[PDB]
Amino acid sequence: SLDRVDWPHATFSTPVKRIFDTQTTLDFQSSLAIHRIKYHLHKYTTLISHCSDPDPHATASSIAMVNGLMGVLDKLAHLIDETPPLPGPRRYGNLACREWHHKLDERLPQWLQEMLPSEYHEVVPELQYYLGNSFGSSTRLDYGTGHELSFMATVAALDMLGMFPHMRGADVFLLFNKYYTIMRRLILTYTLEPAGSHGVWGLDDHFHLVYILGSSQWQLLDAQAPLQPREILDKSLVREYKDTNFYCQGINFINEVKMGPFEEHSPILYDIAVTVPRWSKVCKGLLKMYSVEVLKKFPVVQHFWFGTGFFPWVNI
Amino acid sequence: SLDRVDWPHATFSTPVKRIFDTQTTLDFQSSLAIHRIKYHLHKYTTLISHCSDPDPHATASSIAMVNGLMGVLDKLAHLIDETPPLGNLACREWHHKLDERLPQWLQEMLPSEYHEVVPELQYYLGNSFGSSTRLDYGTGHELSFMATVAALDMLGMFPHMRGADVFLLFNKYYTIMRRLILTYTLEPAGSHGVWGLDDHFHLVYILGSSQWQLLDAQAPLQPREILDKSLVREYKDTNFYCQGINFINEVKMGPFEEHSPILYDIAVTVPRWSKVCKGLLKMYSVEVLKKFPVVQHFWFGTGFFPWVNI
């Protein structure tokens, strides 16, 4: 079923490689793992379009778990401070990064231990994996659509356990906002290379989900939306909304990092801005894109690993 | 003709943007300029397959212009030494001095009966080093280099050019490039990422394969052996491919199969160099010459690379 791991009677183990080559990425297209992924992505998109107008200063859900997953992001956020980067050329993966991940791989299992109540700890090895793989590559010193995909996966797992009763778009907004805060900070500090990047022939170097989320938020208002897709092209306005909206937050981040005229370096986002008249279109289109440009492409999905609990490699 | 320029009767003017969109990238495909590019592409490629084993501490060709141009590369190398970092903001600064001093340096490089040629040359070379303002390098800049050495060829500045010179020249050029990328922290200009051949270069690897192509099975390495870090290291002064793959090897951090899946694929798949070369050319015409993100910024004059039909 696409939505609730059959807790109790369903067993967990360490997830493992399954995507290997071209066919293996395709069999994956029909797996139970994927139908869960696509499902939770739909939900969080649908939800988030309730939150056009999030609380930029929000701090906690009313759901216990969004508050734990909040606080654990918090702990691995404190980790960057404890891991000053290495001097030298701002050009590739900065080496300090291996270290941070060593520290992570050390207290994560502890921090999820505390986070889930007793009865659940037998879920950690599976959970560990996904959260753990959310923040970039352990040894390539990169980060891209594949890990962002892993974080959504973490949450969908926690969700699949039924620990987000009545989760409003504001809870999705809140967890991802911390998530992107952290990933924005990691990419810049560890000076990380893109993974699965399709160059100038892709949406964005590291993200895709941000945009499917941002776009969703203004979906329901399109004409009465504080900005039009045309307008994200205006550095000043994007700034104005970069707290309330993921799409501005995305675009703001490209804009900060990348040096030329926007149209030359982010040609797809440019075309979108200039070609899709309204946000509901962008989101429909950016979802269609996701399921081609991430879910079906190997450089991007091969490090999705499957357990037996949350995201099984069984058929349909 | 693909080969010469009507000197002195074709006229020369500051190049000027011509590729604008999908449409005009497809016209460009029938420009004199493109055939003049394809023509010298082949030339250097077959010449260099003559030179599997070049003198890695050669300094000077026996041709007048290849030392002159060597010397110009050298004059701007030096410019770097006097422009330290904090892409990297010290760099517009370097480009600024390149155009203050470069028309001048090509002044010395040619016979006084030639000065009419600079604005055009000036443009092509002075753009072989990545964008003034975008702070990137990519294969359109590499294609610019070739373009320049082709302008020179087209004024017949290079009689019975040998493989060994098409090395030497290029070998110097990349030496600077590896430097500019690291010292300036230049991003990849116009790239496919993982779905492309190299973040930054395509020609290194055509030349690279040419060289070993004639001897393929008796080549010091075979194409699968680029995947061994130390064998690659042995050859990197003497063979462009290894130099290419060496560069990747010292800059990109994970497994090679993972970060340069395309070069991997080649190496695990294409049995002999001549075929690797054959592929990379076919692929240079799709992936570089027919891709607008990549050629947009190749501007056209009236004299060397003119924007006209056939």
């Binding site: 080559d21 071209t22 395709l26 492409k297 190997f298 450089p299 | 779905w195 899946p261 395309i262 694929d265």
Partner: peptide, 4 residues
Amino acid sequence: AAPK
């Protein structure tokens, strides 16, 4: 699916 994978570059070649």
